[PDB]
Amino acid sequence: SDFDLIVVGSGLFGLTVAERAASQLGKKVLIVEKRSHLGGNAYSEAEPETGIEIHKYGAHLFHTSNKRVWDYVNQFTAFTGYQHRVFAMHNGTAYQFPMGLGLINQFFGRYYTPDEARELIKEQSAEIDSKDATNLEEKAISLIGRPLYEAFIRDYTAKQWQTDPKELPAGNITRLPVRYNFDNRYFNDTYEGLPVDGYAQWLSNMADHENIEVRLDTDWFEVREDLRAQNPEAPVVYTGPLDRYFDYSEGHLGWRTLDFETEVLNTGDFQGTPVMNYNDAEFPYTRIHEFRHFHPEREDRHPKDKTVIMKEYSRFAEEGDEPYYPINTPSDREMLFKYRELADAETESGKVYFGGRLGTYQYLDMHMAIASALSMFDNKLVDALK
Amino acid sequence: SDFDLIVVGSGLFGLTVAERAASQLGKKVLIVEKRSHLGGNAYSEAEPETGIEIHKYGAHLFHTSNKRVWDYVNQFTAFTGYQHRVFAMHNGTAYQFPMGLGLINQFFGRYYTPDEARELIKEQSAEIDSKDATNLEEKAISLIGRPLYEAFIRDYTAKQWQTDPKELPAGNITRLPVRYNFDNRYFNDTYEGLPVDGYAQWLSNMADHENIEVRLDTDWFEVREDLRAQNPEAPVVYTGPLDRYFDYSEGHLGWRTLDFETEVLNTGDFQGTPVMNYNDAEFPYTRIHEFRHFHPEREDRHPKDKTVIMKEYSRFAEEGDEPYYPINTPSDREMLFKYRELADAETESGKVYFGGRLGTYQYLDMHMAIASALSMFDNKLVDALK
Ligand SMILES: Cc1cc2nc3c(=O)[nH]c(=O)nc-3n(C[C@H](O)[C@H](O)[C@H](O)COP(=O)(O)OP(=O)(O)OC[C@H]3O[C@@H](n4cnc5c(N)ncnc54)[C@H](O)[C@@H]3O)c2cc1C
Ligand SMILES: Cc1cc2nc3c(=O)[nH]c(=O)nc-3n(C[C@H](O)[C@H](O)[C@H](O)COP(=O)(O)OP(=O)(O)OC[C@H]3O[C@@H](n4cnc5c(N)ncnc54)[C@H](O)[C@@H]3O)c2cc1C
Ligand SMILES: CC(=O)N[C@H]1[C@@H](OP(=O)(O)OP(=O)(O)OC[C@H]2O[C@@H](n3ccc(=O)[nH]c3=O)[C@H](O)[C@@H]2O)O[C@H](CO)[C@@H](O)[C@@H]1O
Ligand SMILES: CC(=O)N[C@H]1[C@@H](OP(=O)(O)OP(=O)(O)OC[C@H]2O[C@@H](n3ccc(=O)[nH]c3=O)[C@H](O)[C@@H]2O)O[C@H](CO)[C@@H](O)[C@@H]1O
Ligand code: NA
Ligand code: NA
Numbered sequence: 103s104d105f106d107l108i109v110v111g112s113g114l115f116g117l118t119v120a121e122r123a124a125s126q127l128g129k130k131v132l133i134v135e136k137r138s139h140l141g142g143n144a145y146s147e148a149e150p151e152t153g154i155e156i157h158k159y160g161a162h163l164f165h166t167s168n169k170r171v172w173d174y175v176n177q178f179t180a181f182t183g184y185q186h187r188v189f190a191m192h193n194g195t196a197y198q199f200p201m202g203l204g205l206i207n208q209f210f211g212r213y214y215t216p217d218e219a220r221e222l223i224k225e226q227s228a229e230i231d232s233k234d235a236t237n238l239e240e241k242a243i244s245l246i247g248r249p250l251y252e253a254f255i256r257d258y259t260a261k262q263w264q265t266d267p268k269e270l271p272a273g274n275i276t277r278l279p280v281r282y283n284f285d286n287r288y289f290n291d292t293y294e295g296l297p298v299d300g301y302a303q304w305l306s307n308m309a310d311h312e313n314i315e316v317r318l319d320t321d322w323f324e325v326r327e328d329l330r331a332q333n334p335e336a337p338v339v340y341t342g343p344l345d346r347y348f349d350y351s352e353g354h355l356g357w358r359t360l361d362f363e364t365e366v367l368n369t370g371d372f373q374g375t376p377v378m379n380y381n382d383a384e385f386p387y388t389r390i391h392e393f394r395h396f397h398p399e400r401e402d403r404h405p406k407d408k409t410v411i412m413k414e415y416s417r418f419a420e421e422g423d424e425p426y427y428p429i430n431t432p433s434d435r436e437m438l439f440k441y442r443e444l445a446d447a448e449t450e451s452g453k454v455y456f457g458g459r460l461g462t463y464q465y466l467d468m469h470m471a472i473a474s475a476l477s478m479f480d481n482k483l484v485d486a487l488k
Numbered sequence: 489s490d491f492d493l494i495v496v497g498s499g500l501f502g503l504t505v506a507e508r509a510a511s512q513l514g515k516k517v518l519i520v521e522k523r524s525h526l527g528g529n530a531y532s533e534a535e536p537e538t539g540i541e542i543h544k545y546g547a548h549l550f551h552t553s554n555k556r557v558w559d560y561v562n563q564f565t566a567f568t569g570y571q572h573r574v575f576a577m578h579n580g581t582a583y584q585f586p587m588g589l590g591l592i593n594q595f596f597g598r599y600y601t602p603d604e605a606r607e608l609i610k611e612q613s614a615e616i617d618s619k620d621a622t623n624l625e626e627k628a629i630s631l632i633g634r635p636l637y638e639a640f641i642r643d644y645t646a647k648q649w650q651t652d653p654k655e656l657p658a659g660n661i662t663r664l665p666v667r668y669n670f671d672n673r674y675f676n677d678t679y680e681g682l683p684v685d686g687y688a689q690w691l692s693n694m695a696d697h698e699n700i701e702v703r704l705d706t707d708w709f710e711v712r713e714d715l716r717a718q719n720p721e722a723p724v725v726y727t728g729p730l731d732r733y734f735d736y737s738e739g740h741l742g743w744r745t746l747d748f749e750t751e752v753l754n755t756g757d758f759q760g761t762p763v764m765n766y767n768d769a770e771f772p773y774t775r776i777h778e779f780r781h782f783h784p785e786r787e788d789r790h791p792k793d794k795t796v797i798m799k800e801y802s803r804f805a806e807e808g809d810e811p812y813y814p815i816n817t818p819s820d821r822e823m824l825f826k827y828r829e830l831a832d833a834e835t836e837s838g839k840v841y842f843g844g845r846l847g848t849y850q851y852l853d854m855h856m857a858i859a860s861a862l863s864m865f866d867n868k869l870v871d872a873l874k
Contacts, residue, residue: 189670191599
C-alpha cells in the first residue's frame with residue numbers, strides 16, 4: 103500500500119512514532135499536519151528583519167536525564183553547550199535565581215553561609231507548618247517565609263494562573279524551592295542544550311526518511327474517511343485534541359493559553375541575558391525573552407544594533423486561542439476519565455491510538471513526549487503493525 | 489642505548505616532550521624528576537581525612553581555545569563539563585564576578601540595562617584619561633572609576649603584589665575589565681573542564697608508555713655526569729630553573745610565591761562555591777578555595793559533613809619557598825637576556841634545550857606549556873634526534 107501507518111500531527115510525539123515505524127519496522131508512514139509547518143509548538147523560525155531564531159509558540163529549552171532519549175535525539179541534531187540561567191526582576195533589581203545564596207544575599211542585605219542560610223529559612227518559615235497549610239499561599243509561606251513569598255512568588259503566580267494564590271491547591275508546591283549554595287543552573291538534568299542549527303532543522307530531519315510522507319495544511323477530520331478507505335487496516339496514531347475527536351460529547355476540556363508580544367528593538371542588547379522574570383504585579387507580562395542570547399555562538403551572524411524580544415502573557419484559553427496547558431479542575435479531570443474510556447474503545451474498534459499533549463490532555467516536555475512515543479512504539483505499535 | 493633523550497622535570501612541558509618523542513619518534517626517554525611525584529605543580533592528591541581531591545601547589549583550572557592542544561590532552565584523560573565561576577566578597581556581601589550587570593546592580597543599588605551600564609561606566613571613569621595614567625591605580629580608575637576600583641581592585645591587587653598600586657606599571661591593565669551583560673563564565677575559552685579522574689591520573693597516563701622511564705626523587709645536577717656518560721649523544725630537555733643551571737653566575741632571578749593554609753572543617757559546605765575572592769584589606773588571604781565544589785559529579789563519594797578549604801597568601805619568594813610567578817623587574821629582565829645567551833650557547837655546545845616555566849623564566853598556563861612543548865618538539869627535537 104501507499105502507507106502502512108497514519109500519524110496525525112507532527113509534534114515531537116508524532117515525529118518520534120513516525121520515524122521509529124519508518125526506520126525500525128521499514129513501514130510507510132503518512133504524517134497529516136494541520137499547520138503550515140512540521141514540529142508542533144517546538145518549531146522555530148528566523149525573524150525576518152534580523153535573522154535571529156525565534157519561537158511563536160513559546161521558548162523551548164531542551165533538557166533530560168533520560169539517556170535513551172538523549173542518544174535518540176542526537177541522531178537528528180547536534181546540541182550546543184547552552185545552559186539555561188534565569189534572573190528575577192523585583193522592585194527595580196535583577197536577582198540571581200532560583201532562590202539560593204545569591205538571591206538570599208541580595209534580598210536580605212548581606213552574605214549568608216550555607217549553614218546560616220538554612221537557619222534563616224527555618225526562622226522565616228516557622229510561622230506555618232506545611233502539614234497545616236490549606237492553599238498555595240500558606241504552603242509557600244510554610245516553606246520559605248512571607249518576605250520571600252511576597253517578593254518572588256505571589257504576583258508571578260497570580261499572573262500565570264489569573265487567580266489569587268489563596269485559592270490554589272496546597273498541592274501545587276511539593277518541595278523546598280531554595281538552594282543552599284551559589285549554583286544558579288536553572289535545570290538539574292544530566293543533558294542539556296539547544297539544536298545547533300535550530301529546532302526547524304532538527305524536526306525536519308526527523309521526518310526526512312524515504313519511508314515518510316508529510317502532508318501539511320491538512321486537517322485529519324477533513325481527510326480521514328478518504329485516507330482510511332485507501333488502506334482500512336492501517337492504524338492511526340492521533341495526537342490532536344482528545345475532546346474534539348469525540349465531538350465534545352462529554353464537554354470542553356479547559357486550557358491555559360499564552361499571548362506573545364514580539365518586538366524588534368534598535369539596540370544590540372536589551373537585557374543582557376536570555377530570560378528575565380518580572381515578579382511584580384505592576385508588569386502585566388510574566389517574563390521577557392531576548393532570543394539572541396540563546397545562541398551566543400551565532401554572534402557574528404546576529405546584527406550589532408538590533409535585537410528581538412518577546413513579552414509573555416498568561417490567560418485562560420478561549421475559542422481561537424492556542425491551547426497550551428491543561429487547567430485540570432476536578433471538572434476537567436471528570437470529563438477526561440470519560441474521554442479515556444471513549445478513546446480505549448476507539449482503539450479496540452478502530453485501531454486509533456491516542457498520544458501526545460493534546461491527545462491525552464497532559465502537559466509534556468519534549469523529552470517526555472519522546473519517551474512516551476518510544477513507549478507507545480515499543481509496547482503497542484510493533485504488534486499492531488505486523 | 490638505554491635512552492635516546494633525557495627530560496629534566498615532569499611538569500606539563502616535560503611530559504609533553506617525553507610523550508611525543510616516545511610515541512611519535514619511537515625514542516627511549518628518561519624522565520628525571522626531583523619531587524616524589526609526576527606532574528609538577530599541576531599534580532593533585534586525595535586529602536587523607538575526606539578523600540577529596542586537592543592541590544598543594546595552587547588550584548589548577550584547565551581552559552583553552554587551541555584545538556590542537558585540546559585534542560592532544562584528550563588522548564590522556566576525559567574532562568568534565570565544569571565551568572569556572574568566581575564570587576567576590578566585599579564588605580560582607582558576595583558579589584557576582586567578574587564586573588558585569590550583576591555586580592553593577594548589586595554595587596550601585598539597582599538594575600542597569602546594558603546600554604545604561606555603558607553610560608554609567610563612561611561617567612565613572614571620565615575622571616582620568618587612560619592615555620594620561622602614570623601607574624596601575626590611575627590606569628584602573630581611568631577605565632572603571634574610583635568606587636569600583638577601590639571596592640574590587642585596590643586591596644586585592646595590593647595583597648597579590650605586596651605593593652601599593654600607585655607604584656605599579658600602568659601597563660599591568662590593558663583592557664576594560666567590565667562586561668555589559670549577565671554572563672559570569674570566568675574564562676572565555678572554547679574548551680574547558682577538569683580531568684574526570686583527577687590531575688594525578690591524567691599526568692601519570694602521559695608518562696605511561698613502553699618507551700618512557702621515570703626516575704623520581706632525582707635531582708638532575710646530582711646525576712647528570714653519570715647519565716650523559718652512558719650516552720653522550722642523547723640531547724637533554726631541561727625544565728628546571730634557568731639561573732640555577734648556570735650557577736647564578738648572573739644573579740638570582742626574582743619570583744613571587746604563595747602560602748597555602750589548608751583546613752578540614754566539620755561542615756559539608758563552607759561557602760557553597762569553589763572560589764571566593766576576599767577583596768578587603770582586613771583579610772590577609774586573597775581567596776578561599778573549597779575543593780569539593782570543583783567536582784560536584786563526585787558528591788556521593790564526598791563526605792556529607794566535612795569539607796576541605798584552603799586560604800591563599802601571596803608574597804615574595806625567599807630561599808626555601810617554591811618559585812611560582814616571575815616578578816619581571818627591569819633588573820630581572822636584565823639578567824634574563826644574559827641567561828638566554830648562556831642557554832643558547834649551551835644548546836649549541838651541549839645539546840641541552842631550555843623550556844617550561846622555570847627553564848625560561850615565564851609563567852605558563854597548562855595549555856600554553858603544552859603548546860610550547862609541541863612547538864619545541866616539532867621545530868627542534870625531531871631534527872636533533874635523527
Ligand atoms: C508554551 C510552550 C512552551 C514549551 N516549552 C518547552 C520547553 O522549554 N521545554 C520542553 O521540553 N518542552 C517545552 N514545551 C513542550 C513541547 O512543545 C513538546 O514538544 C510538546 O508538548 C510535545 O507534545 P506533542 O508532540 O503531542 O504536541 P504538539 O507540539 O502540540 O504537536 C501536535 C501537532 O498536531 C497538530 N494537529 C492538531 N490537530 C490536528 C488535526 N486535526 N489534524 C492534523 N494535525 C493536527 C498540531 O498542529 C501540532 O503540530 C512547550 C510547550 C508549550 C506549549
Ligand atoms: C600557583 C599556580 C597555579 C596554577 N594554576 C593554573 C591554572 O589554574 N591553570 C593553568 O592552565 N595553569 C596553571 N598553572 C600552571 C601549571 O602549573 C603549568 O602546568 C606549569 O606552569 C607548566 O610549566 P612546566 O611543566 O615547565 O612547570 P612545572 O610544573 O614547574 O614542572 C617543572 C618540574 O621540574 C622539576 N624540576 C625542577 N628542578 C629539577 C631538577 N634539578 N631536577 C629534576 N627535576 C627538576 C620540578 O620538580 C617540576 O616537577 C599554575 C601554576 C602555579 C604555580
Ligand atoms: C513544573 C514545571 O517545570 N513546569 C513547566 C514550566 O516550567 P518553568 O521553569 O518555566 O516554570 P514557571 O516560570 O512556569 O514557574 C512555575 C511556578 O513556579 C512559581 N514561580 C516561578 C518563577 C518565579 O519567578 N516565581 C514563582 O513563583 C510559580 O508558582 C509558577 O507558577 O513551564 C515550562 C515551559 O512550558 C515547562 O517546561 C515546565 O515543565
Ligand atoms: C592574566 C592572568 O590571567 N594571569 C593568571 C592569574 O589568573 P586569575 O584569574 O587567577 O587572576 P588573579 O586572581 O590573579 O587576578 C589578576 C589581577 O586582576 C586583578 N583582580 C582580580 C581579581 C579580583 O577580585 N580583583 C582584582 O583586582 C588584580 O590586579 C590581580 O592581580 O592566575 C592564574 C592562576 O595561576 C593564571 O592561570 C592566569 O594566567
Ligand atoms: Na514551616
Ligand atoms: Na577615562
